[PDB]
Short mmCIF file of C-alpha atoms in Angstrom, two decimals:
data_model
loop_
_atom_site.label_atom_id
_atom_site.label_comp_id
_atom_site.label_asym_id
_atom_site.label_seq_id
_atom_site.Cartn_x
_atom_site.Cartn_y
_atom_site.Cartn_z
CA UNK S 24 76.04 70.93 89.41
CA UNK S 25 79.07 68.94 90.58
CA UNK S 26 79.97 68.75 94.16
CA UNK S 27 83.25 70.13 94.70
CA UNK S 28 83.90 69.71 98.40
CA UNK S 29 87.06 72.09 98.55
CA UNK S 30 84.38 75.11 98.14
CA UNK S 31 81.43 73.77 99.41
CA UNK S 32 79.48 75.27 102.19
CA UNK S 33 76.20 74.21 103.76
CA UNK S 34 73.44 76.58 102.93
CA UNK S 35 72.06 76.56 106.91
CA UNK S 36 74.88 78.20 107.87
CA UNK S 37 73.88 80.87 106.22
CA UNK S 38 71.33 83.43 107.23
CA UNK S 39 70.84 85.77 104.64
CA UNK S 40 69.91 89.88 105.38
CA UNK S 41 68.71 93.19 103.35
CA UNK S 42 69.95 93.10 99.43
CA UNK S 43 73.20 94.88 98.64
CA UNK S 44 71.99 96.03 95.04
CA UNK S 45 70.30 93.87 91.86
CA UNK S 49 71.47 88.30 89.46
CA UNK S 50 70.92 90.13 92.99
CA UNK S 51 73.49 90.15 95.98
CA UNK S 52 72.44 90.34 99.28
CA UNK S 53 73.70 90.71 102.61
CA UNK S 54 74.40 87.63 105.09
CA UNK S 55 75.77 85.88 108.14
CA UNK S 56 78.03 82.68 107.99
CA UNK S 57 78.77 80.69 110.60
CA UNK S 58 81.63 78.48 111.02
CA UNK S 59 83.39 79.86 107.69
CA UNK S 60 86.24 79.24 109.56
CA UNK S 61 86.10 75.48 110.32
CA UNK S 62 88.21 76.14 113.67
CA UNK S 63 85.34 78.65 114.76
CA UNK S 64 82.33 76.48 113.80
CA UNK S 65 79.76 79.01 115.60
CA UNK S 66 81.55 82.05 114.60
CA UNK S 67 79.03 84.37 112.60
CA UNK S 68 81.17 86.79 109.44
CA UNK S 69 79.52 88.96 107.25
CA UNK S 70 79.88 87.55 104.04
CA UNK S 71 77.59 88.96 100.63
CA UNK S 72 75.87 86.09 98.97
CA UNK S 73 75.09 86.14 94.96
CA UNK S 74 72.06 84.15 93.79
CA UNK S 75 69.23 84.36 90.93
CA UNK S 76 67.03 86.63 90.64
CA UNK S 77 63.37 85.27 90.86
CA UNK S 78 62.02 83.81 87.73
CA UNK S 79 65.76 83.68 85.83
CA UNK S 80 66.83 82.52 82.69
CA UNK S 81 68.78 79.75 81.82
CA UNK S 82 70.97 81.92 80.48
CA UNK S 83 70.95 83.92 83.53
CA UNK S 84 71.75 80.80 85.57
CA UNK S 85 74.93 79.71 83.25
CA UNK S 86 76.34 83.27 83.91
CA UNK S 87 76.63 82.79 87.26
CA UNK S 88 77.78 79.51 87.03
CA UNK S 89 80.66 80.84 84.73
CA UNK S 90 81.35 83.60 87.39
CA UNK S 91 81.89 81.03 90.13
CA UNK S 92 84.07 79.15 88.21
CA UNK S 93 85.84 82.26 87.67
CA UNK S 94 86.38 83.26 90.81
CA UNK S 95 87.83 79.30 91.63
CA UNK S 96 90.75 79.61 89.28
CA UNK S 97 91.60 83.31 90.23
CA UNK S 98 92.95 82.39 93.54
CA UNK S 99 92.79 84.78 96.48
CA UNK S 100 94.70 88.46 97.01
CA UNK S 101 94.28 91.20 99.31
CA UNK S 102 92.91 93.91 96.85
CA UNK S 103 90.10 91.49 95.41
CA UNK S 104 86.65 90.51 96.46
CA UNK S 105 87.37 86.80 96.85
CA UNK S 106 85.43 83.91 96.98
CA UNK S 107 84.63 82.10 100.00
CA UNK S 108 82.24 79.57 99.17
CA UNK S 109 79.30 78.04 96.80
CA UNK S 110 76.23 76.37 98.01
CA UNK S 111 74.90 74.04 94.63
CA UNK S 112 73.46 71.12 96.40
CA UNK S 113 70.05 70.61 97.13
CA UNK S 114 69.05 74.18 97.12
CA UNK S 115 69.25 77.23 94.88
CA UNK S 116 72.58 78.45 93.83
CA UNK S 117 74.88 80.60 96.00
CA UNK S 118 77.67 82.22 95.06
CA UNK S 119 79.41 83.09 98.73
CA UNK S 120 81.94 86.46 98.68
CA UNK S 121 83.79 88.69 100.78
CA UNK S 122 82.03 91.69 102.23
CA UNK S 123 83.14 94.90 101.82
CA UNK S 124 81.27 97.48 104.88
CA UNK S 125 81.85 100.86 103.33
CA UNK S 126 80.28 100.17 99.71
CA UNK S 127 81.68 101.23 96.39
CA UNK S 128 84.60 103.67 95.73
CA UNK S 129 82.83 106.18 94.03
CA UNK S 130 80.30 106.39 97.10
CA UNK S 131 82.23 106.35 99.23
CA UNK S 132 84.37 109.25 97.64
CA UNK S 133 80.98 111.69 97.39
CA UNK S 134 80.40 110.98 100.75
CA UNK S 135 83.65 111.93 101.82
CA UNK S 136 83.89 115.56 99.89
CA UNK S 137 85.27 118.71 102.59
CA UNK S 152 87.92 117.15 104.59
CA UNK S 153 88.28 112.75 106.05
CA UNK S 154 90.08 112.48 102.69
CA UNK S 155 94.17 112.93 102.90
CA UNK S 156 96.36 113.54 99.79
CA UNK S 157 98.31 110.39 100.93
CA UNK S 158 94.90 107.91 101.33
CA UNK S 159 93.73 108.85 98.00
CA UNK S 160 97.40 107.68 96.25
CA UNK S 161 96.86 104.83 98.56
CA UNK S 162 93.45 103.52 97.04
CA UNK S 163 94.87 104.29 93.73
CA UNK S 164 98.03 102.17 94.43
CA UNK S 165 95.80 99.48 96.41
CA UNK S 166 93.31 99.11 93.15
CA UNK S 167 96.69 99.02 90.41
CA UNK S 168 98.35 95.93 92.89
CA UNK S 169 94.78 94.03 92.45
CA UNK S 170 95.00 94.64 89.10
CA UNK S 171 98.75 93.64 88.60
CA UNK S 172 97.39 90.46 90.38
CA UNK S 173 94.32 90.03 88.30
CA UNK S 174 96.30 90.88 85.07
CA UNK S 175 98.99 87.93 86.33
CA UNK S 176 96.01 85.28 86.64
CA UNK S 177 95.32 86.57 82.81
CA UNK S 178 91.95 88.47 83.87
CA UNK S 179 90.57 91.23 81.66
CA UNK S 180 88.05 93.48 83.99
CA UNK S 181 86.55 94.82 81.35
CA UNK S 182 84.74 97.05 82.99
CA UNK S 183 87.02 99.04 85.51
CA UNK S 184 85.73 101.84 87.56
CA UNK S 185 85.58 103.57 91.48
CA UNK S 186 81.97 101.47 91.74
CA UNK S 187 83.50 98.17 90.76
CA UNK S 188 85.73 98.78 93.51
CA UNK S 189 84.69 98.46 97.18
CA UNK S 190 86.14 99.19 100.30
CA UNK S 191 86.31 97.44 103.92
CA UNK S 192 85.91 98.45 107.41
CA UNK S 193 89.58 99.04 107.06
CA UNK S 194 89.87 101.56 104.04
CA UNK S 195 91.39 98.45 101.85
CA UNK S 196 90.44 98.69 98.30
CA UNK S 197 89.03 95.08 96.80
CA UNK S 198 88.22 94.80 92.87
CA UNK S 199 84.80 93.65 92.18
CA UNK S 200 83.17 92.04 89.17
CA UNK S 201 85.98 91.23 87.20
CA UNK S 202 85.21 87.54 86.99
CA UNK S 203 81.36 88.92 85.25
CA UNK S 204 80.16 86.97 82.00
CA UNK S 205 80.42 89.98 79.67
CA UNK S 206 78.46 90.37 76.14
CA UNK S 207 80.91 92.27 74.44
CA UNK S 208 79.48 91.53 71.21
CA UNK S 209 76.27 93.20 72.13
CA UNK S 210 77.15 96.58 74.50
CA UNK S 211 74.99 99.81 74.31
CA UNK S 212 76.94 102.04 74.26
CA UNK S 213 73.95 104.91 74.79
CA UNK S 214 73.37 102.66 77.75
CA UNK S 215 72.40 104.56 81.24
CA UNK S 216 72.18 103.11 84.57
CA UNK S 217 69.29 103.62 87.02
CA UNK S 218 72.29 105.73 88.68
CA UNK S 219 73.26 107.96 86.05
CA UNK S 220 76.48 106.07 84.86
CA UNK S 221 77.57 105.97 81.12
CA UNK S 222 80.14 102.76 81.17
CA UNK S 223 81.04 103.56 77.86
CA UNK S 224 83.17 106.35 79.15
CA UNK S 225 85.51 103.99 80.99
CA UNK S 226 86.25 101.73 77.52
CA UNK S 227 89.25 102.51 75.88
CA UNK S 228 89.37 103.79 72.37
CA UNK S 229 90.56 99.90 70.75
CA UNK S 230 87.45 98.10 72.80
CA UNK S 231 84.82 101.33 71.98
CA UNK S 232 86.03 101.12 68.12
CA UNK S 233 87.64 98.15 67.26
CA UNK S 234 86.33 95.87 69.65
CA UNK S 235 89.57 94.56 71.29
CA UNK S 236 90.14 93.89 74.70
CA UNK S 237 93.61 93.69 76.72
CA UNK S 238 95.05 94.49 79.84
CA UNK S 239 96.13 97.50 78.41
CA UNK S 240 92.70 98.61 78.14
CA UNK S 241 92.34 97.93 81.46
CA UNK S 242 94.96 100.21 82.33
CA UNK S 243 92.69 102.97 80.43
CA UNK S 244 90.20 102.37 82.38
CA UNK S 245 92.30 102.74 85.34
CA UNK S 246 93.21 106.03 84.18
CA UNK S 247 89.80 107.21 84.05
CA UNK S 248 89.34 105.74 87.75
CA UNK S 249 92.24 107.73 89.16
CA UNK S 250 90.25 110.68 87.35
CA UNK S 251 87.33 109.78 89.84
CA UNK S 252 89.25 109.27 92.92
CA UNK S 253 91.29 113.05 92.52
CA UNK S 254 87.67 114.20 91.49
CA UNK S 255 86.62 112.59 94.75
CA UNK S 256 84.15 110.91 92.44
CA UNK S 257 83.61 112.74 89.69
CA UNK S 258 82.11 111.49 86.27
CA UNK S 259 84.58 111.57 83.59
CA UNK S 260 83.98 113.82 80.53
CA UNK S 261 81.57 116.15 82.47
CA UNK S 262 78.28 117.43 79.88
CA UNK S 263 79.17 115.50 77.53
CA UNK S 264 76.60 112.67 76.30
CA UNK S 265 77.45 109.61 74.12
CA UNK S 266 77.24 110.97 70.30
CA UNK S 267 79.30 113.77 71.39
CA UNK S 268 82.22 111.21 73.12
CA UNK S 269 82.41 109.35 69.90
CA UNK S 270 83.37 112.46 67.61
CA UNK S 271 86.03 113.51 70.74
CA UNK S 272 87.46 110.46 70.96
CA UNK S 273 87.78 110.48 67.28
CA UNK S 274 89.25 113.55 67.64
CA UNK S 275 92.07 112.84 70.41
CA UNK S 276 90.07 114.67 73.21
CA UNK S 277 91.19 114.18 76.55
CA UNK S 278 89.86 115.52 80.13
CA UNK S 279 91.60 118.33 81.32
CA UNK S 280 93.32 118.17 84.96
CA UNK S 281 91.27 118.18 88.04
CA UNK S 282 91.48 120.87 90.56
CA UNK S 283 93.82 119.93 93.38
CA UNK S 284 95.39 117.56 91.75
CA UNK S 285 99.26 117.29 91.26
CA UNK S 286 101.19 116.87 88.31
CA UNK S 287 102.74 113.67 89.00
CA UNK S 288 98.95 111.97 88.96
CA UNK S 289 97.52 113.67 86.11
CA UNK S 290 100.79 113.10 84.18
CA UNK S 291 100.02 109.41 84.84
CA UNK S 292 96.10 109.59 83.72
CA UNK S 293 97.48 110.80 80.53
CA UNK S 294 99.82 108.14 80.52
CA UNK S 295 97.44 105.63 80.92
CA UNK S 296 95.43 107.16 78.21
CA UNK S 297 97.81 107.21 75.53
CA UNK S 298 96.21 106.14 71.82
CA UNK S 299 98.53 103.18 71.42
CA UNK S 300 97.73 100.65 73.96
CA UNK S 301 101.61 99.85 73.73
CA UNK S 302 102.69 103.10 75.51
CA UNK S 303 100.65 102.71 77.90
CA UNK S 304 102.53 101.75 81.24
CA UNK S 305 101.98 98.55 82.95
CA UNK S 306 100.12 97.87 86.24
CA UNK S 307 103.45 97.00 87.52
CA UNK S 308 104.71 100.26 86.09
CA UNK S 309 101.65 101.91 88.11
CA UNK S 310 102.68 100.32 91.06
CA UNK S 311 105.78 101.16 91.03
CA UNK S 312 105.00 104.96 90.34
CA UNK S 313 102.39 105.21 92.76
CA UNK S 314 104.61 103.29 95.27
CA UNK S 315 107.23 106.18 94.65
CA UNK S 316 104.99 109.43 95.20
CA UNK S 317 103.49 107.27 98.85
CA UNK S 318 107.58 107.03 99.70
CA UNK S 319 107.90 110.70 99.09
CA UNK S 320 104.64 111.48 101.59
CA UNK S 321 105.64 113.93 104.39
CA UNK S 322 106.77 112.72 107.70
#
């Protein structure tokens, strides 16, 4: 690995903590991250190997980092910090985000500490990351409430969209140690026809706007996988959540129109979502 001094960052300033989740992140203090603080501690999250990895498994992180280089930095992203790849194993150095994932931190949140006007907000906070992501030509892929996480200060930061992907080899029937089923966040094209845009992103997002007004729900409730291939087939589409206004579930449906082409934009969704926070009660 080449040294590239503009990212570099010396692995004894590090002190790394209790895993995050599992290669494997785990939690850590930095000091000096900013140079003009040189014994100021941060929290940071730190991505490395997992013991006994592949090579495979090593080049997929590599390719993340150098991701994560080219993206350059916004507000509503987890973005990198620093890299330790000298004389030591590799370390992948990101933003920390204290309150976890989305989706947890909806659950944990049912009544109620969740506002009408904060939900729109994380919905509007997650399209302007993607708007961003989508101008730096970055398909997520895989957009959902637990790829997003959220800081000490309620602000909404994408995660995992700089992942190596196999999207020749998903499965589909696939179940996390959590329960999820990620094929019920791919839009129709990807699921059949194997084609990824940033309009299928914007499906996804749909489905993740389902979660946050189900205050983290899982999309198409009781329904497994061999049943969500014949109802996609078939034009289904989840019905709208309880407590949930028009204006948003008119814009789920939107998002999940069958021709990627009518779908709006993220800067469409910002726009709309930036509209109904405007029209919040004073």
């Amino acid at each position: 690995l080449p040294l590239d001094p503009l990212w570099e960052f010396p692995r004894d300033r590090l002190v790394l903590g209790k895993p995050l989740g599992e290669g494997q992140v785990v939690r850590a203090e930095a000091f000096g991250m900013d140079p003009a603080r040189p014994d100021q501690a941060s929290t940071v999250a730190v991505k490395m190997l997992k013991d006994n990895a592949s090579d495979k498994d090593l080049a997929d992180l590599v390719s993340e980092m150098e991701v994560m280089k080219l993206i350059g930095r916004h507000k509503n992203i987890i973005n990198l910090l620093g890299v330790c790849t000298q004389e030591g194993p590799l370390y992948v150095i990101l933003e920390c985000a204290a309150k976890g994932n989305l989706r947890e931190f909806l659950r944990a949140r049912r009544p109620g500490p969740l506002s009408f006007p904060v939900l729109v907000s994380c919905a509007y906070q997650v399209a302007r990351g993607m708007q961003y992501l989508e101008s730096r030509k970055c398909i997520h892929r895989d957009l959902a409430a637990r790829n997003v996480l959220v800081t000490e200060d309620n602000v909404m930061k994408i995660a995992d969209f700089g992942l190596a992907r196999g999207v020749h080899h998903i499965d589909y029937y696939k179940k996390t140690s959590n329960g999820r089923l990620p094929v019920k966040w791919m839009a129709p094209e990807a699921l059949f026809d194997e084609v990824y845009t940033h309009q299928s992103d914007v499906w996804s997002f749909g489905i993740l706007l389902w979660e946050i007004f189900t205050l983290g729900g899982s999309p198409y409730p009781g329904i497994p996988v061999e049943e969500l291939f014949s109802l996609l087939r078939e034009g289904h589409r989840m019905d709208r959540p309880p407590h949930c206004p028009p204006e948003l579930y008119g814009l789920m449906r939107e998002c999940w129109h069958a021709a990627p082409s009518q779908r709006p934009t993220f800067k469409q969704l910002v726009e709309a979502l930036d509209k109904v926070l405007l029209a919040v009660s004073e």
